[PDB]
PDB file of C-alpha atoms in Angstrom:
ATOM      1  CA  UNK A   1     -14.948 -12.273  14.158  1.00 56.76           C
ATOM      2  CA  UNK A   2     -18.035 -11.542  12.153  1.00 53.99           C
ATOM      3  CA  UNK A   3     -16.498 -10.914   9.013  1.00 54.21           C
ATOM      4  CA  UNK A   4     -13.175 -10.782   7.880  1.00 53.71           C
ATOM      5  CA  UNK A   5     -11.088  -7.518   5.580  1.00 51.90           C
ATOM      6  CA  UNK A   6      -9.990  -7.743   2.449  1.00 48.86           C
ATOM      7  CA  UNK A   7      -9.717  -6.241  -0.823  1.00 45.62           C
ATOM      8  CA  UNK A   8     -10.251  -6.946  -4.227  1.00 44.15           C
ATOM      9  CA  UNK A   9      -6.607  -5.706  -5.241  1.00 46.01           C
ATOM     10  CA  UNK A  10      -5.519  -7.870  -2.914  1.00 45.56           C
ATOM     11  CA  UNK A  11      -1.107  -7.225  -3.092  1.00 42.73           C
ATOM     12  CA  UNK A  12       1.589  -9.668  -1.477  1.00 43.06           C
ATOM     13  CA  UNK A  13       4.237  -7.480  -2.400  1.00 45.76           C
ATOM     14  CA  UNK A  14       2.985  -4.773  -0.409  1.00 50.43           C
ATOM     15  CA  UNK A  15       1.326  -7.598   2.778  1.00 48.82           C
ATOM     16  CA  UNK A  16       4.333  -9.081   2.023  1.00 47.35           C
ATOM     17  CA  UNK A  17       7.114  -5.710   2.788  1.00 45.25           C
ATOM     18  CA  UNK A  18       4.869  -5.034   6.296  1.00 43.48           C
ATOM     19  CA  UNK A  19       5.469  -8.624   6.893  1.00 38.68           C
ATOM     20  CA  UNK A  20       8.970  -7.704   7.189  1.00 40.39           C
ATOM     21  CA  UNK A  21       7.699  -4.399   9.496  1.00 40.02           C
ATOM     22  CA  UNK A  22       6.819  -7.403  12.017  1.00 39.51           C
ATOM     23  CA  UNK A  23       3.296  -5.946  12.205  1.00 39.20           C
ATOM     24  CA  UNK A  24       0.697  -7.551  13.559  1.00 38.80           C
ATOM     25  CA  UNK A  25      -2.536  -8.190  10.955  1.00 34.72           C
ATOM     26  CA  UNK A  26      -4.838  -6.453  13.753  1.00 36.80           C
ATOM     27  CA  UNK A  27      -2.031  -3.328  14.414  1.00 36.12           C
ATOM     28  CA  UNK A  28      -3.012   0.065  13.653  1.00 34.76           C
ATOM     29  CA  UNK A  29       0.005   0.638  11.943  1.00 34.83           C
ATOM     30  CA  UNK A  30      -0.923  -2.707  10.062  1.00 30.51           C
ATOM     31  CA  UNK A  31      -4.128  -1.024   9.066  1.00 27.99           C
ATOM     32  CA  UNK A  32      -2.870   2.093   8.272  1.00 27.80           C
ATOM     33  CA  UNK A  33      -0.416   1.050   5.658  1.00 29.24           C
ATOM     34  CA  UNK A  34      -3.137  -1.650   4.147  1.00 31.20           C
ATOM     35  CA  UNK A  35      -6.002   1.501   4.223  1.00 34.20           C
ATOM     36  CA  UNK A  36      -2.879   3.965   2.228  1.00 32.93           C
ATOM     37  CA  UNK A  37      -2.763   0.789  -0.502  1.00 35.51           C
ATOM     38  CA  UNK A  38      -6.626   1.209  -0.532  1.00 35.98           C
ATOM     39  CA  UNK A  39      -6.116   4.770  -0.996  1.00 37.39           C
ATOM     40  CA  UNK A  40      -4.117   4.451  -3.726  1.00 38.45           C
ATOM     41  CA  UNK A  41      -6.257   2.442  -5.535  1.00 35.01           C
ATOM     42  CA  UNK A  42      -8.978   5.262  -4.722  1.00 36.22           C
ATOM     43  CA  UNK A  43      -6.861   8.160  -6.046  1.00 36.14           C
ATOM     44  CA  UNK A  44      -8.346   9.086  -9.533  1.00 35.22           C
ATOM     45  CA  UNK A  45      -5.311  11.175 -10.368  1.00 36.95           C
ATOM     46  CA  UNK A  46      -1.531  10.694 -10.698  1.00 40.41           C
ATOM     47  CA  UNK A  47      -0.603  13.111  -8.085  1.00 42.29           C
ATOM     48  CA  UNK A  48      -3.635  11.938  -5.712  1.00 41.67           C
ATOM     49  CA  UNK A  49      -2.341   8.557  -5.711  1.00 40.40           C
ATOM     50  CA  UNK A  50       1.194   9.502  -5.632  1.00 37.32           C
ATOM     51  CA  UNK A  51       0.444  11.392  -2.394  1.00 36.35           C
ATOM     52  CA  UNK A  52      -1.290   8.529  -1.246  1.00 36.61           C
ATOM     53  CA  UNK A  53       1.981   6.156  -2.361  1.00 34.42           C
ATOM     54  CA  UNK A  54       4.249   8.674  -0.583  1.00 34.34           C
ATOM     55  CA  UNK A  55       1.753   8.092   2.978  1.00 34.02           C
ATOM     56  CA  UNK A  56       2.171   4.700   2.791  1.00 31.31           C
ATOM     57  CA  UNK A  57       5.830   4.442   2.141  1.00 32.09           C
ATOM     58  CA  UNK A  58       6.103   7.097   5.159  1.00 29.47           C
ATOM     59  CA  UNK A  59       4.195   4.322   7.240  1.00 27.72           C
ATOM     60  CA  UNK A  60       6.135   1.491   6.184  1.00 28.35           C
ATOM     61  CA  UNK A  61       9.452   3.111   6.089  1.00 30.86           C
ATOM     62  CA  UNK A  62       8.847   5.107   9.550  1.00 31.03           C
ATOM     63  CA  UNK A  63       7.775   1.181  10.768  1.00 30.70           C
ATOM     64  CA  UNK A  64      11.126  -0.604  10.248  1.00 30.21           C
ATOM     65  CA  UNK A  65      11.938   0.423   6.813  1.00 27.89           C
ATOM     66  CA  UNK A  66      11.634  -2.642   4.940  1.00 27.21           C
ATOM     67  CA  UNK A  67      12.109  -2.654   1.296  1.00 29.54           C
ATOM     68  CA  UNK A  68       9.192  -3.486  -1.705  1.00 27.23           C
ATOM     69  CA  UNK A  69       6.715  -0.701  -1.699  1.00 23.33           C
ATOM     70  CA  UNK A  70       8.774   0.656  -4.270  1.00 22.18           C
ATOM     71  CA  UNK A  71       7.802  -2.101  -6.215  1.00 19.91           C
ATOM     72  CA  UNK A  72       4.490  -1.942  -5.627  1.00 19.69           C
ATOM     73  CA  UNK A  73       4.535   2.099  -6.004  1.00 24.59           C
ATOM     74  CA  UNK A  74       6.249   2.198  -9.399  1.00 22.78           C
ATOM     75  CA  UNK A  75       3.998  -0.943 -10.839  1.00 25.30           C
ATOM     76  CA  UNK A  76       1.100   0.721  -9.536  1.00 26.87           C
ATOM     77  CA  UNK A  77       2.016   4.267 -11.171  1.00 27.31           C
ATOM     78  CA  UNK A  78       2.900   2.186 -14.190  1.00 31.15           C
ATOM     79  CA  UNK A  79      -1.186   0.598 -14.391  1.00 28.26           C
ATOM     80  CA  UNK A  80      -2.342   4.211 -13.974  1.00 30.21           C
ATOM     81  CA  UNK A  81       0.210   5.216 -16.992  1.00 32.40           C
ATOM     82  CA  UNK A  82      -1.726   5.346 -20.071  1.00 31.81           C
ATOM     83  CA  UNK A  83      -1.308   5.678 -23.735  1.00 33.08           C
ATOM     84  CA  UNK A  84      -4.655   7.419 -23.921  1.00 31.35           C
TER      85      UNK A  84
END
């Protein structure tokens, strides 16, 4: 391999909850719900990102249904919160 992904976010919860999926790190599916976590972080809205936290739920929970992207989606909706 030339290069190997990653990202600067970088979540075991989430790795963690499609560990549990029994995905393989080079499955689509594996990709897809790692590319929705990416698109969360690129969603510059509340509703954007909750769309995007919603897609990869409906990834992971169409998978196998295991049980943490909650956790992930409600911490993550809590860093966008903002007093401001």
């Amino acid at each position: 391999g030339s290069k190997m992904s990653d990202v600067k976010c970088t979540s075991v919860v989430l790795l963690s909850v499609l560990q549990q999926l029994r995905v393989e790190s080079s499955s689509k599916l594996w990709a897809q719900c790692v590319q929705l976590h990416n698109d969360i972080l690129l969603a510059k809205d509340t509703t954007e990102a909750f769309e995007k936290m919603v897609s990869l739920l409906s990834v992971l929970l169409s998978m196998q249904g295991a049980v943490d992207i909650n956790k992930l989606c409600e911490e993550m909706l809590d860093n966008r919160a903002t007093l401001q």
